[PDB]
Amino acid sequence: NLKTEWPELVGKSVEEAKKVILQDKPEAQIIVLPVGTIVTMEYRIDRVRLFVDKLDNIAEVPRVG
Amino acid sequence: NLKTEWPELVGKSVEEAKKVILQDKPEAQIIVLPVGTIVTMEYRIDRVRLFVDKLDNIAEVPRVG
Amino acid sequence: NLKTEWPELVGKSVEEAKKVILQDKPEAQIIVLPVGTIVTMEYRIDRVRLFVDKLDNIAEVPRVG
Amino acid sequence: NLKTEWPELVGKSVEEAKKVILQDKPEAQIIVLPVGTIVTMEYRIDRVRLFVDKLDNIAEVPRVG
Amino acid sequence: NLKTEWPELVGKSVEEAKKVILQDKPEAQIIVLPVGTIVTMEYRIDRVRLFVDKLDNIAEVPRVG
Amino acid sequence: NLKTEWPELVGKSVEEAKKVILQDKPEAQIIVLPVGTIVTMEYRIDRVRLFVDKLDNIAEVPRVG
């Protein structure tokens, strides 16, 4: 199996979002970036990037990679 | 039906704007970004992005997506 | 008629500039952005964008749109 | 005549630089922007843009326009 | 030999990451930049760039250069 | 002669770096910019730009120009 996306998280705080992701993916390495950030094309299975808005709310669906 | 745009909101504060949108779209997930931000081409029906100016006023017509 | 540009405003503070614009265009929706900001190609007659410098002075001629 | 460039100003503070420019161009409208800022292609004879570094020192030769 | 990449570091703090790198590469010159930063194409053997997220966690695999 | 590059400076503080450069080039006009900054293609012999990281350390080899 595998849970790789957290659509239910758009709009929630980073605090709330961490808590859920860690529940579902105990080994996740959570990265917090501002929306519009260009990342390196490297794929990492244990990583979860959160793309946040000005108030630190999840602005896009979190996904593994 | 559907209310998907809030033209009447250009120039108003984020506080004022939240209040109106939530009135019209109780399930809206409000995202606040600075004008000029490049977003991901993903369409979400419950989402409302607010594009704000330096003083946090709505700079463009808010819309669903 | 119509007053759509405030060339006399380059260099003045946002506070001073607001005051003048509102005098001439009582219905103006004043938006304050940093110089170099890319805006959405939408035209709004009641809107006045102020493009400011590091000290919040008007850096370019204010115009309707 | 006309004094349109202040090469002698690279490295000096904005405070120092203002003082000199105003000496030479009493009608100058001084604009302070960070180096790397893209401006609008509009030419203004009374305007002097200062392009500053992280410490607010003049990083490039000030010029009219 | 040579240790040139620290994959085990994604997600860790800059403080933690410094400590490990210096352990493995005592002569490393540690540089801390935000993710999405465009660097100069110059290669330096003693240098280790850390690409950090909003909370200062390592967002990409640290490497020499 | 001429000393135009300070390779020995990568990783050092701006404070430390100033001190060295001024030692070697007493007439240097020191400019401090963040890495990734696009500068104007103008060449100045008395100028030394320092490209700094998030902690204000020299991230690239300082050079005249």
Side-chain angles (χ1 to χ4, degrees):
Chain A
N1 338 210
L2 224 40
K3 197 182 190 192
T4 58
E5 77 177 53
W6 291 263
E8 69 265 31
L9 286 180
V10 181
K12 316 223 146 18
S13 83
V14 152
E15 346 353 339
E16 308 181 78
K18 260 175 183 134
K19 191 154 275 83
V20 163
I21 293 157
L22 275 182
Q23 202 130 327
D24 301 349
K25 176 179 190 81
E27 78 284 12
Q29 291 299 313
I30 302 171
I31 299 308
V32 175
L33 308 167
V35 169
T37 307
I38 305 224
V39 291
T40 335
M41 131 190 106
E42 64 182 72
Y43 179 76
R44 296 242 334 182
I45 207 201
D46 58 324
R47 178 160 67 208
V48 183
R49 284 167 185 136
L50 299 183
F51 284 92
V52 311
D53 81 353
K54 265 189 104 135
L55 295 183
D56 291 316
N57 287 322
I58 299 4
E60 9 199 323
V61 170
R63 267 173 286 259
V64 168
Chain B
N1 338 210
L2 224 40
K3 197 182 190 192
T4 58
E5 77 177 53
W6 291 263
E8 69 265 31
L9 286 180
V10 181
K12 316 223 146 18
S13 83
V14 152
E15 346 353 339
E16 308 181 78
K18 260 175 183 134
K19 191 154 275 83
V20 163
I21 293 157
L22 275 182
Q23 202 130 327
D24 301 349
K25 176 179 190 81
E27 78 284 12
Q29 291 299 313
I30 302 171
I31 299 308
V32 175
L33 307 167
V35 169
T37 307
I38 305 224
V39 291
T40 335
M41 131 190 106
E42 64 182 72
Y43 179 76
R44 296 242 334 182
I45 207 201
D46 58 324
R47 178 160 67 208
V48 183
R49 284 167 185 136
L50 299 183
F51 284 92
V52 311
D53 81 353
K54 265 189 104 135
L55 295 183
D56 291 316
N57 287 322
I58 299 4
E60 9 199 323
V61 170
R63 267 173 286 259
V64 168
Chain C
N1 338 210
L2 224 40
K3 197 182 190 192
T4 58
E5 77 177 53
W6 291 263
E8 69 265 31
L9 286 180
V10 181
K12 316 223 146 18
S13 83
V14 152
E15 346 353 339
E16 308 181 78
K18 260 175 183 134
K19 191 154 275 83
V20 163
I21 293 157
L22 275 182
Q23 202 130 327
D24 301 349
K25 176 179 190 81
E27 78 284 12
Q29 291 299 313
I30 302 171
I31 299 308
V32 175
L33 308 167
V35 169
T37 307
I38 305 224
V39 291
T40 335
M41 131 190 106
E42 64 182 72
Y43 179 76
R44 296 242 334 182
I45 207 201
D46 58 324
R47 178 160 67 208
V48 183
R49 284 167 185 136
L50 299 183
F51 284 92
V52 311
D53 81 353
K54 265 189 104 135
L55 295 183
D56 291 316
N57 287 322
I58 299 4
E60 9 199 323
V61 170
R63 267 173 286 259
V64 168
Chain D
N1 338 210
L2 224 40
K3 197 182 190 192
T4 58
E5 77 177 53
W6 291 263
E8 69 265 31
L9 286 180
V10 181
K12 316 223 146 18
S13 83
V14 152
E15 346 353 339
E16 308 181 78
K18 260 175 183 134
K19 191 154 275 83
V20 163
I21 293 157
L22 275 182
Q23 202 130 327
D24 301 349
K25 176 179 190 81
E27 78 284 12
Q29 291 299 313
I30 302 171
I31 299 308
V32 175
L33 308 167
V35 169
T37 307
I38 305 224
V39 291
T40 335
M41 131 190 106
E42 64 182 72
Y43 179 76
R44 296 242 334 182
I45 207 201
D46 58 324
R47 178 160 67 208
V48 183
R49 284 167 185 136
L50 299 183
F51 284 92
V52 311
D53 81 353
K54 265 189 104 135
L55 295 183
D56 291 316
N57 287 322
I58 299 4
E60 9 199 323
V61 170
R63 267 173 286 259
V64 168
Chain E
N1 338 210
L2 224 40
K3 197 182 190 192
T4 58
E5 77 177 53
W6 291 263
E8 69 265 31
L9 286 180
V10 181
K12 316 223 146 18
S13 83
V14 152
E15 346 353 339
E16 308 181 78
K18 260 175 183 134
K19 191 154 275 83
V20 163
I21 293 157
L22 275 182
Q23 202 130 327
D24 301 349
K25 176 179 190 81
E27 78 284 12
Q29 291 299 313
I30 302 171
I31 299 308
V32 175
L33 308 167
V35 169
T37 307
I38 305 224
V39 291
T40 335
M41 131 190 106
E42 64 182 72
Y43 179 76
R44 296 242 334 182
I45 207 201
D46 58 324
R47 178 160 67 208
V48 183
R49 284 167 185 136
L50 299 183
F51 284 92
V52 311
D53 81 353
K54 265 189 104 135
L55 295 183
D56 291 316
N57 287 322
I58 299 4
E60 9 199 323
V61 170
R63 267 173 286 259
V64 168
Chain F
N1 338 210
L2 224 40
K3 197 182 190 192
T4 58
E5 77 177 53
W6 291 263
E8 69 265 31
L9 286 180
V10 181
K12 316 223 146 18
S13 83
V14 152
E15 346 353 339
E16 308 181 78
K18 260 175 183 134
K19 191 154 275 83
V20 163
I21 293 157
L22 275 182
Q23 202 130 327
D24 301 349
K25 176 179 190 81
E27 78 284 12
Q29 291 299 313
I30 302 171
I31 299 308
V32 175
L33 307 167
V35 169
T37 307
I38 305 224
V39 291
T40 335
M41 131 190 106
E42 64 182 72
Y43 179 76
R44 296 242 334 182
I45 207 201
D46 58 324
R47 178 160 67 208
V48 183
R49 284 167 185 136
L50 299 183
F51 284 92
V52 311
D53 81 353
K54 265 189 104 135
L55 295 183
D56 291 316
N57 287 322
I58 299 4
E60 9 199 323
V61 170
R63 267 173 286 259
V64 168

